[PDB]
């Protein structure tokens, strides 16, 4: 029979104006889904590395860290703290075996940088916006469905685009900019320019830019399952970040 | 030493 483990983390970022990182927040699961004859038995090994929490003897360093784990209940941990792995007997179905968060900073650089610049004249209602995107992802490695969001000022439309890749969508609809970029690569740099006009009252606010993605075969964390091993079966381990919440400062 | 869920 088949069984599916994947590792899943919510990204969560906020990103001054300057690029400075204020705040990044991980959220991570690792869940199941099997349906294995009776009596059987499940081992989970993760990264061998990893540390949790904030030793106050130790200190913590560069290294593959959470700031805070928890279990399932039906988990056993005998051969967590000298191995990292995890034993047991699932269900039937789905089961979210292991959850765990981080506020410190990610082992690898965040996966994008944005270079925004605008020119607005008060003026003659000519709003000009440049934004500039880059992906620092490992260039072998893709972003999914990503999507930047631009909150406009009030009463905002659309004079021109220019769009760097033709594969690029972008319009203007409920007050704010929705630029699509479905080809993105580690090392990609994108770019579009928007001339807008912007009315006078009757009769700013620009940003924050919010992005949302996908990241395949990819942990924040940098945390791994190493092996998944069964005891009486096709087998896919996944990894996979997202976020709906990568804040960046205009 | 461990913090556990139920769901």
């Known amino acids: 029979n088949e069984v599916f483990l994947d590792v899943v983390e919510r990204l969560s970022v906020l990103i001054a104006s300057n ?3 204020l705040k990044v927040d991980v959220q991570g699961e690792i869940r199941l889904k099997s349906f294995l004859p009776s009596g059987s038995e499940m081992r ?3 990264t ?3 540390s949790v929490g904030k030793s106050e003897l130790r200190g913590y360093g560069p290294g593959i860290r959470v700031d805070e784990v928890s279990f399932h209940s039906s988990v056993n941990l ?3 703290e000298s191995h990292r792995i995890l034993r047991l007997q699932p269900p039937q179905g789905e089961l979210t075996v292991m959850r765990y968060q981080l506020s410190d900073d990610l082992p690898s650089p965040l996966p994008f940088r944005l270079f925004p610049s605008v020119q607005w004249d008060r003026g003659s209602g000519r709003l000009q916006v440049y934004l500039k995107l880059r992906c620092d992802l490992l260039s072998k ?14 009463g905002v439309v659309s004079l021109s685009q ?3 890749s033709p594969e690029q969508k972008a319009e203007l609809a409920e007050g704010a900019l929705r630029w ?3 080809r993105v690569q580690g090392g990609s740099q994108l770019s579009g320019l928007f001339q807008m006009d912007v009315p006078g009252p009757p009769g700013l606010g620009l940003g924050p830019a919010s992005l949302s993605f996908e990241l395949p075969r990819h942990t924040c964390s940098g945390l791994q399952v190493r092996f998944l091993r069964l005891a009486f079966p096709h087998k896919w381990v996944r990894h996979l970040s997202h976020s709906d919440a990568y804040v960046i400062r205009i | 030493t461990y913090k556990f869920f139920e769901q």
């Open chain 1, 19 to 21: 690029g400075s990182l």
């Open chain 1, 180 to 182: 699509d970029l479905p």
């Open chain 1, 141 to 154: 490695s893709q972003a999914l469905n990503v999507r930047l969001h631009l909150p406009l000022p009030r």
């Open chain 1, 48 to 50: 061998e590395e990893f």
């Open chain 1, 44 to 46: 989970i090994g993760l």
């Open chain 1, 78 to 80: 005998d051969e967590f």
């Open chain 1, 162 to 164: 220019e769009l760097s």
